[PDB]
Design a protein around this ligand. Sequence first.
Ligand SMILES: O=C(O[C@H]1Cc2c(O)cc(O)cc2O[C@@H]1c1ccc(O)c(O)c1)c1cc(O)c(O)c(O)c1
Ligand SMILES: O=C(O[C@H]1Cc2c(O)cc(O)cc2O[C@@H]1c1ccc(O)c(O)c1)c1cc(O)c(O)c(O)c1
Ligand SMILES: O=C(O[C@H]1Cc2c(O)cc(O)cc2O[C@@H]1c1ccc(O)c(O)c1)c1cc(O)c(O)c(O)c1
Lengths: 496, 496, 496
Amino acid sequence: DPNFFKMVEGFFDRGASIVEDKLVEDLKTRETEEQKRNRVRGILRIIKPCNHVLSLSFPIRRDDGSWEVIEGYRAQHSQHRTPCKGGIRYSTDVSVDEVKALASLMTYKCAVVDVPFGGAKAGVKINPKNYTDNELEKITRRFTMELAKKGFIGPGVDVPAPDMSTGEREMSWIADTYASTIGHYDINAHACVTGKPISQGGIHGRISATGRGVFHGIENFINEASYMSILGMTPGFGDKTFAVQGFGNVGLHSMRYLHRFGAKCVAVGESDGSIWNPDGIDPKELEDFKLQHGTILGFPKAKIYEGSILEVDCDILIPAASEKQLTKSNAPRVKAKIIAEGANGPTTPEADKIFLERNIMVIPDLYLNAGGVTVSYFEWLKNLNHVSYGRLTFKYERDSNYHLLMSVQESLERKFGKHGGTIPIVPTAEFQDRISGASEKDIVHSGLAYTMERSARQIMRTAMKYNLGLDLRTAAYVNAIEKVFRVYNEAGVTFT
Amino acid sequence: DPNFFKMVEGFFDRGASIVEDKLVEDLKTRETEEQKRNRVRGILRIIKPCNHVLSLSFPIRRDDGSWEVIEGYRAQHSQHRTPCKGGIRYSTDVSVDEVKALASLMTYKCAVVDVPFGGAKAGVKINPKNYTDNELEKITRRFTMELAKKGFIGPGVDVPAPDMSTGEREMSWIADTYASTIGHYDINAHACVTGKPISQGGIHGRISATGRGVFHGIENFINEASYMSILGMTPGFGDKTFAVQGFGNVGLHSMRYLHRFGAKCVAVGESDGSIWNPDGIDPKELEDFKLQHGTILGFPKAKIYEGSILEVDCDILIPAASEKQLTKSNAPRVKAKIIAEGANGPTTPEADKIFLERNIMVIPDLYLNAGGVTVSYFEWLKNLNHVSYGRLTFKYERDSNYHLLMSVQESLERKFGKHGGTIPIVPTAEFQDRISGASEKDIVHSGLAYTMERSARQIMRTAMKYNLGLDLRTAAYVNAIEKVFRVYNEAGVTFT
Amino acid sequence: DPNFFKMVEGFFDRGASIVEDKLVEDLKTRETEEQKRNRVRGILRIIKPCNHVLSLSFPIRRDDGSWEVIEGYRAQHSQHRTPCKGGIRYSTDVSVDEVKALASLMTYKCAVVDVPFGGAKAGVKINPKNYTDNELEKITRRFTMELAKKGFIGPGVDVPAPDMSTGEREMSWIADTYASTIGHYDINAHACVTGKPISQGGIHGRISATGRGVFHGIENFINEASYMSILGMTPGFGDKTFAVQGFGNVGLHSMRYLHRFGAKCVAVGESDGSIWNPDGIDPKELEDFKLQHGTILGFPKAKIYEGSILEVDCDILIPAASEKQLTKSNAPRVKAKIIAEGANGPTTPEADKIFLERNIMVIPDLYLNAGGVTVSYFEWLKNLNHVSYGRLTFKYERDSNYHLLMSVQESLERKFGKHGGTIPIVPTAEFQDRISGASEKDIVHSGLAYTMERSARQIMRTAMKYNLGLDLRTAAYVNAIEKVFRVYNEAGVTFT
Ligand SMILES: O=C(O[C@H]1Cc2c(O)cc(O)cc2O[C@@H]1c1ccc(O)c(O)c1)c1cc(O)c(O)c(O)c1
Ligand SMILES: O=C(O[C@H]1Cc2c(O)cc(O)cc2O[C@@H]1c1ccc(O)c(O)c1)c1cc(O)c(O)c(O)c1
Ligand SMILES: O=C(O[C@H]1Cc2c(O)cc(O)cc2O[C@@H]1c1ccc(O)c(O)c1)c1cc(O)c(O)c(O)c1
């Protein structure tokens, strides 16, 4: 746990130095000096800092009747894209310099995965356990309100999302508040927030989103030996053990869908304990260990283990909990060989230099948990379209398929003069399930893969153009910076 | 060696403790517990901190073509009144904790003089000498824009003002920006800022406003020996020497109008040096020492003097420059007798306990320069009325008087049989000039006096109610607190 | 008789038939038919029904956690004047037809005193004693919301007021909600409801409003002998007695001011008993029977009397309590000479043809107690002008008078050799306290006073045109109608 603050500011500067030659060479203009350096040196000094960042403070009535002040923050990084976006967090750790960095990170995350959004982030310095459910509703509903009055919430202005100990039911309050007060007259009022439950205009598949993101991100890597020929290991994805931190939302489903494919587990940790089992624990059982009683503490197969969470002899480690759990106190340790950032910045630049020198591949959060916002993107789009995806183009498409297949049948039955034998009316077993169980989530799942997979091409191409090889982090930010630049370059200085 | 931030936080807490008794006493309800404290002890915890405060960051291009980032801040303290009020500052000293304190100060300043405004403040971390006029316009107009976006400028939401290094021309750009872009459709668009020049919707007597405020504030004190029977010093207002710091806007007319009434000067200081002359210098001459040359440096009868500005042998000192120039390094000094705070918070709580223990009169900024916003109030009101004051009720007044006077004539020539003798048609010499040189200016001066004078009564009543005597500072805040509390107590916790 | 339902429908229709001739006569257009009647006969049928009325149904939840559906209504009668006006009511009495009726009343009521307000009224079908204060805030707060989303609360659209069991604190919740959700961007947000407390932007004189309205309505008839040469009685206002009913708010001030000026009392009684004393009870002592005890029961000189309240021998009877206290069961007696309707229509058309046929004067509530909304009208304007009336023109007008008084003195001290002898500097003792105690009240009471005086001069003129002599009721509505008609006529049929 370092002070740092400038955690993300280092990576930008790192990626910034290398594109200083590309932008001056790719820009086609009539200025042609070396003040080209001076324009670009200026353009990057604008993207670095957050353009707006509102500090807040509002009172509420506890169930006592006692009165308490609540500090809250929200930072819009860039506004190159019309709507900023980023989750909101409820924890005592909440700091001003926190969201100022996190919102910055969200800008480049949206750039990597070609999501037309600006980076944003918020935070409330409370502790959610210490308040009731009735107490916590008034915090969110009024936090909503005090943000709409100053233009930090609304479709096309800013769209927040859930995060640390923030769930669907809370976003539902956000929506219900905005659609009943300020954004009343707005048709797309319910689009003010992504992550709301499905009866509230949500989308199928974001419950899983960060998980499949964790999954699809790892998938596009241990299926290409171009990075195993250096790291070692086996393209045989199966027999690989993993360990998660922070069993919650991102922690569950990064495991719920990682197990499915034959990849065993070995450990699970929360904010008090850990688990150790070389046989491989199964979320089949231990998932009814949440509110069934309360807090994890071991179970059948689940042994009580303490020391830390990383430590354990493993392959794939995912610190999907709080922030900066990896520093020099533990970077030369970690009996692992590939790390994947499920949470936002658990790896510090203090540790990358060590990992890089030990041939350990850390999957950057800037890429990995980008599925969450990519689907968030879709959820937003859903509310602007006011239709479940495929709600009109399923029967037309499944009827078009069934006519197409039979068309090859009958076309095969006149070259074959008896009409009755051939039968291609039946599609393959996988495809028959595709049009019988056709829903909205299938569109989302395929779009998530098409966005995720094509983004890994944008990295593993820009990494092999600069010999980064294993440092995909400095290969990620160097692609996002280039995408946000042209957005500023081709927009021109605005004289207002 | 000044001190840190909490500047005003101590004064509120200082005044807050003594109202804790009468608030539970004057409150008339069926609540009736000792929880009366818990409501009130809670209500005060809401008023202390600023409710909103936007940190800004916007880019501009110098006349170079070079690009520079400009950090900008703005704090709305309270929102108990529908609009917030507070000037904006242009200086490298600009800090977040600065305006946060200053905006707090403005809330109570507007409460002392019964001005239905909420406190606010802003600042721009630049240095105006280092930019051109063409360069500085871009800052203001852009800064305007980024504030209307997030709702920190607009009539009935937040109205800024000029301050130090900010003049009428800049307020004119503010207005011209707001009235051509965001608030175009607003009828009262030009009401978004007070302090603008007269051809742009200002008000006569505002150029002088802070000055007359300094004057009438001092006037209501050396006109009653109930504070000279303890301080010493003659009620004969004339033969009193004064010295000003910061020959700029507030420094000028706090002297220009103070000299008028027969009060000798002795010293004037700026950011370079000072002046020392026991005969008394005259603004009639050394006022053409601004842009005529550029900076002060002595003149005929103006000698070069250094050392300091405050220690000079004087009676009335007015630190009308930056902030906190009176601390432990100079409080047990100052060869003065009565000090008057022309700028915002030049006396620290570190210096009051030294001044009070030596029987020295410090006139609180919370009250002194309140004329500045009191006229600001009027200028705002002018734009919602869209008439210069008296623009219709002058000839009706001047004609009604002349009919009234001849009515006493014609009624006195009836009891006196000759019809031609008596002549009360003519008013006193002073009243003849009144209805001849009648303008908007006069309605402002009389309303400023009426507001100012009645405020001193609300203080000197609540001062000897608690045996404060010489510490009118704590008699000021103790009066403003109870005015804002009433606004909060009778508005109720808003479930939103 | 329409004892509850079409309560006023008789009054309109009865008044409607009368104006038929004048309107076609007063009509100056190029029509010139017998179809001129068709125009007016239709236009009146436009005014008779409330053109809009919303029936509501919104839920809450009590301190228990249980849930209750709340019915509510609000009726916007006319929209000829841009904002609509009328209080809200919190009783089980509340009925669709009830508010649909009282809204009609408020239209013509605010057309007699010449107030540019359209008529409206609202109600909520509950009983406040059954709900806690906390429970009553959320009812009030959300009732506001559901009226704004549908356009029934807002300056220039519709402005409510207090009334039956509706206090200032409740009006304070209406504003705080409207001004914090829908009408946030509105400068006149808090101008959406009148009757709110002082600190929240109220006006001085609401509490004392209807009492003065009663008195000035009285004053404009015992001072005109046109209506004493037919009723009898001495115009000599002095030695006359009055009997009140409903010793509260309207009752107190209607007596306190009526006595102060010369009238003697005789009787007082509320929902318990009555007092009898032809010596004349004095309100300056018996008013400490309020919450100092709990209810009336008589006191020294205050006899314990039964029977009723009205039949007491007296001259001036005022029913300042509930609805309908005068029918065929008491009209053939009540040996009084004049009845002023302190409440809303305590006199039935089942009793006017007894009072009219007995040469008694019943003063319409259409004009008398209309002194509450006219002051409530001023409070609206205060919230619009954001200034206490005369905040600026108090020291200016006080300074103007002394200069006048000295102008005559100095004018008289020159035709007389010595300079200082004469002393008209001091004005009359009644005038000295006027400029000494000059406050908002004095302006409201006058603006009130001139309003009904002109109004009375407008009724008594329209009555002497149709020989109504004693039917002020039908002489009252007959006036408001032509005003409402003239608005509609010169506007035309809106083709939308
Ligand atoms: O609308 C689109 O415009 C983006 C296209 C684009 C790109 O392909 C490459 C690149 O290097 C920059 C770049 O700029 C835009 C952009 C997008 C997202 C951001 O966050 C951001 O700052 C800027 C878009 C989106 C897709 O997904 C597509 O497949 C597609 O063809 C177009
Ligand atoms: O509309 C008026 O309401 C203010 C009257 C008032 C008062 O006289 C004393 C007090 O202790 C509290 C208080 O509350 C209101 C207020 C005003 C200004 C603020 O900043 C603020 O927070 C609250 C007003 C304004 C005048 O100038 C008057 O002369 C006048 O009679 C009434
Ligand atoms: O702007 C004003 O127009 C009103 C003046 C007026 C009138 O004097 C007599 C009449 O028969 C009709 C009439 O039409 C208007 C009106 C006003 C109020 C209503 O409710 C209503 O339906 C219609 C006004 C208001 C005043 O208070 C004045 O003193 C004044 O000179 C002018």
